[PDB]
Design a protein around this nucleic acid. Sequence first.
RNA 1: CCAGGCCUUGACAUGCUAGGGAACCCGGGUGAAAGCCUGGGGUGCCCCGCGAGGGGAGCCCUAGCACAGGUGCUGCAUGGCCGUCGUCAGCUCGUGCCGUGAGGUGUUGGGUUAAGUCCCGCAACGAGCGCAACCCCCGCCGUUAGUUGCCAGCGGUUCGGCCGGGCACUCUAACGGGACUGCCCGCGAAAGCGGGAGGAAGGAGGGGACGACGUCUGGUCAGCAUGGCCCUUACGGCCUGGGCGACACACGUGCUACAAUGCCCACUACAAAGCGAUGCCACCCGGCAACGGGGAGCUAAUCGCAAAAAGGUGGGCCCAGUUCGGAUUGGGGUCUGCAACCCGACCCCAUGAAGCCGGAAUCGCUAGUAAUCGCGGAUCAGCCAUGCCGCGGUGAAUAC
Lengths: 206, 97, 23, 83, 127, 60
Amino acid sequence: GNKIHPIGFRLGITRDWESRWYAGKKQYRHLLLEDQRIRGLLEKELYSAGLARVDIERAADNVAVTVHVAKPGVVIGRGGERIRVLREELAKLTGKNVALNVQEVQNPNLSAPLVAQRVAEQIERRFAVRRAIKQAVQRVMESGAKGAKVIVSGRIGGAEQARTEWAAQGRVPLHTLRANIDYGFALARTTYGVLGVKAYIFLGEV
Amino acid sequence: IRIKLRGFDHKTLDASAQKIVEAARRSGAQVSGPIPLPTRVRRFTVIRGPFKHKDSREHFELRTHNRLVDIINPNRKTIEQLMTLDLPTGVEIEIKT
Amino acid sequence: GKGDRRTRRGKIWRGTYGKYRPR
Amino acid sequence: PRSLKKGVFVDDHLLEKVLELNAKGEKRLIKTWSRRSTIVPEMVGHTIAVYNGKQHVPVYITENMVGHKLGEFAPTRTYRGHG
Amino acid sequence: EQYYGTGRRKEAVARVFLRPGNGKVTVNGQDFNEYFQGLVRAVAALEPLRAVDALGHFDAYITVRGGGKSGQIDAIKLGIARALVQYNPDYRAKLKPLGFLTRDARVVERKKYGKHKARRAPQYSKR
Amino acid sequence: ARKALIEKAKRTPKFKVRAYTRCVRCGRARSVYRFFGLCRICLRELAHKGQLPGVRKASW
RNA sequence: CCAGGCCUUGACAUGCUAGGGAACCCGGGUGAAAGCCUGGGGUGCCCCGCGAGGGGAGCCCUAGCACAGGUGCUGCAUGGCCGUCGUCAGCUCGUGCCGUGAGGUGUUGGGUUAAGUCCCGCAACGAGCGCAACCCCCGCCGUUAGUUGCCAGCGGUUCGGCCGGGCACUCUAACGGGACUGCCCGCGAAAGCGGGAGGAAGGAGGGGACGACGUCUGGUCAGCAUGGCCCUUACGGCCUGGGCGACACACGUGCUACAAUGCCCACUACAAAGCGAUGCCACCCGGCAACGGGGAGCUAAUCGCAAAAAGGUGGGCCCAGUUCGGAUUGGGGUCUGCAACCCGACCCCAUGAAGCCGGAAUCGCUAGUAAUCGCGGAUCAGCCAUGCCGCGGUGAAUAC
Ligand SMILES: [Mg+2]
Ligand SMILES: [Mg+2]
Ligand SMILES: [Mg+2]
Ligand SMILES: [Mg+2]
Ligand SMILES: [Mg+2]
Ligand SMILES: [Mg+2]
Ligand SMILES: [Mg+2]
Ligand SMILES: [Mg+2]
Ligand SMILES: [Mg+2]
Ligand SMILES: [Mg+2]
Ligand SMILES: [Mg+2]
Ligand SMILES: [Mg+2]
Ligand SMILES: [Mg+2]
Ligand SMILES: [Mg+2]
Ligand SMILES: [Mg+2]
Ligand SMILES: [Mg+2]
Ligand SMILES: [Mg+2]
Ligand SMILES: [Mg+2]
Ligand SMILES: [Mg+2]
Ligand SMILES: [Mg+2]
Ligand SMILES: [Mg+2]
Ligand SMILES: [Mg+2]
Ligand SMILES: [Mg+2]
Ligand SMILES: [Mg+2]
Ligand SMILES: [Mg+2]
Ligand SMILES: [Mg+2]
Ligand SMILES: [Mg+2]
Ligand SMILES: [Mg+2]
Ligand SMILES: [Mg+2]
Ligand SMILES: [Mg+2]
Ligand SMILES: [Mg+2]
Ligand SMILES: [Mg+2]
Ligand SMILES: [Mg+2]
Ligand SMILES: [Mg+2]
Ligand SMILES: [Mg+2]
Ligand SMILES: [Mg+2]
Ligand SMILES: [Mg+2]
Ligand SMILES: [Mg+2]
Ligand SMILES: [Mg+2]
Ligand SMILES: [Mg+2]
Ligand SMILES: [Mg+2]
Ligand SMILES: [Mg+2]
Ligand SMILES: [Mg+2]
Ligand SMILES: [Mg+2]
Ligand SMILES: [Mg+2]
Ligand SMILES: [Mg+2]
Ligand SMILES: [Zn+2]
């Protein structure tokens, strides 16, 4: 096991943090821990909606949580309903100005954390792991993407000898920093144990 | 008369460090420029894997860049309009006299 | 010397002070 | 050592047992977990059972062995040698 | 009236001032030979003036910051050389063959993780 | 000894000497950084994800 | 981990039944503590409420049921993360061609490069993961900005950039420029190779980040995740003590040395990166000292840590198991902490061991490197740090 995490490798170049705020030595942890408590609760409920990106902003005792998602309707609710019932739930933990937005995802197939999340689902439903991956890539590419690669490790089909299977199409220059790589990881539970799903999407370079 | 500007990302510090200085340069009168103070750096070094493997670490850094601007000749037209400024999230300000 | 506490060079090693290295 | 400006340490609860018995006249047995204590002049002639982690070790205190700690008289390790 | 070049070597920085006068040389408010006493490596800092016969012709106010006495010396040696090239542009010949205008990027290499220093590896025993 | 230990770790003790830091994310008792509240393992995991404000890889 | 004393919806989550009253704070008996026994004190809402009185449910207590909990086993069921060969020049794919077929071809061949690097050739023609580039630090210059940083000039100067005054210079920290075999001679089919120039920089500029398909049924169920197997008044949990620090021995990585290119004392220089509001602590005083009592500044380019040290000047030692070396122990103190017996660091008086350059064997380093010198940081009450991650000072030898 050798390769670098291709997100953290690109911070400050092609990818930007999901927590953009300042704090001094004596306060940093307490806020960061809240983002931790928040992101869990959000992804506990919003997993259904098709959660893509959890952005958090701060100033002083107030915070704007910009959530990206593939079904904005399941997030917002009945006429402003669900998105409300979370605002209260949100400021219960936060104890502060919980401004909770919901943003469009102009294609789940160009969203790496989504492509993965779906494959993690398909194999929870006893589906052909090889075929499912070639499909996952085949979707992403048909939506004009420049390149794609998808990886599943674990007891495929229940096999006793664990195996890592993978597939790819186009370009994926993970050594290149001026190239945009969206990466998303999805962990699939089953009866025989857990498998892991890695997705890399090459949008295009800068 | 003093403005202090502090953030984690400098490209948004210099945006806001210029923007505040343009404002007071508008509504009168003296701007002693955006003087970039030395950055205070806290490095984090850590063994990569979860178990053993001591001879392989990774280096992380945290840059708390500093800025200072001096609006010298006040003109309280500045005292109202600064109270309304568009300073992005990742940045702190401290105001003195 | 560097191991000998009762000297100048010795207390510089430890990073402490005393009669044999005053501050 | 224990900083001279402060006190001479004895665990509150044990000191009392010595002093209670001093009135009545000593001595029964004193099962203790007070290694952190100091042997103290009032303790001479008593027979104290010190816990070494394992046992309650019977130690008759004398006029000579006063300034020390209790646990110096209850050995923590069993060692008979090698081979 | 004055001629300044910027001299660097390592962490040492040289502010050097060339002025026609007896040949007096000063560093941080002391006579050169006082500030560099017993440093055999010093006399060579005042080398570029030999490159163009300037032993007596100039005085010098010089400050110095960073590095150490011999890193500070090499910066000076560069700066007084640097300063001559402005006082007389024709001095470029007989200064480049001496490499007096060029400054080396030779600096202390980063201590690397998994090593004792920058390159000294930890000693190793197989069987 | 596990969950009872992350829980014993937060409650204020019988003497203040006994204060020890447990990584607020996974509960690791060893290598816990004050600044983040995390262990060197979580440190790297959140960071790589880009959920640590202002944090980026050092290269010099 | 072990000894002893203890707890049973349980130190913890999400539910229901019913009892108290909700909640929270203060003490008491007992015991090593835990625990077990106890003595206090007043609930909002919304409500029939001048009235006995009644509940809902923010919460604590109590008898049960669910269920908790396990660093118990399995890295030979696993995800993740890492080591590794290896920064090595490699590993494949699409189509076509070849072979009954595994497969070959391309990827071999000439040359060139740090490289499947580029060129030339060819039943091959392209495509991909790697190489390189894009990103960071450093070396030169520039634009912008001038305090807390800098002071070239002038003027004041209590003699300190201290004040006026200035951003020129050093700097601080962002945005650019610059290097490309681009020019010359030449050898070359070409890619390139030797040399020359300009230039701070030259042929990847120095270092960093970055690690192909795979290998090791590699490592980690003890960071976490997780299938399964296993325990349930206990393989869970709470505590007090002890162990993880043992010692006939063997090995690994280290520190300090055996000395004169040295040891010691006095006076005297020149770094960098960091760090710091029950934190760093200038300065003053008590102390041989560790430290202790005062007390100023600093949310820190302002104030502090702070002396950098090897170095320089002078003086002593005079070849000795020593004014080398600083282990071992005796005695006395400071501090941190509830507490330094096991088992902390530091200071002082005395003690002053081995060791005279290391058997067979064996390690690292190709230049600002090795060697030597000090400084900081993470963890952190203190610290067993001589470890680790960094930072500068001085600064080689050698590659036929
Ligand atoms: Mg089953
Ligand atoms: Mg000595
Ligand atoms: Mg030495
Ligand atoms: Mg001389
Ligand atoms: Mg060095
Ligand atoms: Mg090591
Ligand atoms: Mg090894
Ligand atoms: Mg657990
Ligand atoms: Mg502690
Ligand atoms: Mg800890
Ligand atoms: Mg394995
Ligand atoms: Mg194993
Ligand atoms: Mg594994
Ligand atoms: Mg083919
Ligand atoms: Mg054949
Ligand atoms: Mg055929
Ligand atoms: Mg084939
Ligand atoms: Mg090949
Ligand atoms: Mg082949
Ligand atoms: Mg060939
Ligand atoms: Mg190579
Ligand atoms: Mg290529
Ligand atoms: Mg070919
Ligand atoms: Mg300028
Ligand atoms: Mg060449
Ligand atoms: Mg590369
Ligand atoms: Mg194995
Ligand atoms: Mg586990
Ligand atoms: Mg398991
Ligand atoms: Mg151990
Ligand atoms: Mg041996
Ligand atoms: Mg060592
Ligand atoms: Mg050794
Ligand atoms: Mg002797
Ligand atoms: Mg101790
Ligand atoms: Mg001696
Ligand atoms: Mg002998
Ligand atoms: Mg001798
Ligand atoms: Mg030697
Ligand atoms: Mg030798
Ligand atoms: Mg031999
Ligand atoms: Mg080499
Ligand atoms: Mg510290
Ligand atoms: Mg410490
Ligand atoms: Mg010890
Ligand atoms: Mg140190
Ligand atoms: Zn953790």
